[PDB]
Design a protein around this nucleic acid. Structure first.
Ligand SMILES: [Ca+2]
Ligand SMILES: [Ca+2]
Length: 295
DNA sequence: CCTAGCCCACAATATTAAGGCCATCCCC
DNA sequence: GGGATGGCCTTAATATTGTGGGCTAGGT
């Protein structure tokens, strides 16, 4: 029906676990509490989110913006489903720490304890270390938030669990693109390369290393980059793309809007492999393909 | 009244999708 | 060594997580 590791991979890429504490005097604490699991996608991926909706058997899909939709689960009863899933197919990235805090928050909630002052203070303390933390509104309303705040759970990376996790994740958080460049020394005075990359935040250094080892690219100790904010890898060696990247994703396939892109990626790979990118007709073919990708 | 169900829609910054150009390879 | 690819480094414009707000119903 729907591979469960892909779902965890896609969720590592795309989901978010929020606990919203919204100011509202119609409530007895002055605050409403909203637990939200959410994946936001372009309107073009409504069918992917519908598949996810049936797989889980819970959740609703709503208009999210001019050309976007959101799959949302906000009920504590229905969130039992999404929690059970991840207990069985755990998040691989640091998101797992946001998830752990979301669980703790949800216990306060399932026990109606968020409707007391003691419970609210607990949630502020949990929310302090969750995603973007407290807005200004909460810091004003709870000046002692620093003391309430809880230790972010520490995150040690235990590895890639299943090849489907990779395609789930890559479906949301990888890039397939055409790298056009000037070439003085070539007869066309222009040049093409294919590029597959994944760019994450530096706290995922270990994951980026585990990924490059998984594809069998780790050879040489390079094409991996650690900027101060970003850990990244990019494959541009045509043989590496042809023999390691494509064969993987032919088997564990990219899903959603990025598959239209993977498909064009391969079209271009077919043109290069046949040396037709050295003719101007072919190089235009590629430029035309490129224009229509990711855009 | 006091709550959650359900829905639409913004924010700012991490991400996504590239682009420049030196180093290096190899068929010839 | 002409003609091509590999790889390190850089970056803009805005999707992407993450969030904010309000209408509604139902129990008590
Ligand atoms: Ca992501
Ligand atoms: Ca993504």
């Amino acid at each position: 029906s729907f591979n469960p590791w892909f779902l965890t991979g896609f969720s590592d890429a795309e989901c978010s676990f929020s606990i919203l504490i919204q100011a509202n005097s119609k409530y007895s604490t002055g605050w409403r509490i909203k637990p939200v699991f959410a994946i936001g996608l372009h309107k073009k991926d409504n069918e992917l989110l519908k598949r996810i909706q049936s797989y889980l058997g819970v959740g609703k899909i709503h208009i999210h913006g001019k050309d976007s939709i959101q799959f949302r689960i906000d009920s504590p009863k229905e969130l039992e489903v999404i929690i059970n899933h991840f207990e069985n197919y755990p998040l691989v990235t640091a998101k797992q720490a946001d998830y752990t805090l979301f669980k703790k928050a949800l216990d306060v909630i399932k026990n109606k304890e968020h409707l007391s002052q003691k419970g609210l203070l607990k949630l502020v303390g949990i929310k302090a270390s969750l995603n973007l933390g407290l807005n200004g509104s909460l810091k004003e309303a709870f000046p002692n938030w620093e003391e309430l705040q809880i230790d972010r759970p520490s995150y040690v990376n235990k590895g890639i669990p299943d090849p489907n996790w990779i395609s789930g994740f890559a479906s949301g958080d990888s890039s397939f693109n055409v790298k056009i460049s000037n070439s003085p020394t070539s007869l066309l005075n222009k040049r093409v390369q294919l590029r597959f990359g994944i760019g994450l935040n530096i706290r995922e250094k270990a994951l980026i290393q585990y990924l490059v080892a998984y594809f069998d690219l780790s050879d040489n100790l390079k094409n991996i980059y650690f900027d101060l904010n970003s850990a990244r890898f990019e494959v541009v060696k045509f043989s590496d793309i042809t023999d390691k990247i494509i064969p993987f994703f032919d088997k564990y396939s990219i899903q959603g809007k990025k598959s239209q892109d993977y498909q064009n990626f391969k079209e271009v790979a077919d043109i290069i492999k046949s040396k037709n990118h050295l003719t101007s007709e072919g190089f235009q073919e590629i430029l035309d393909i490129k224009a229509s990708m990711n855009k």
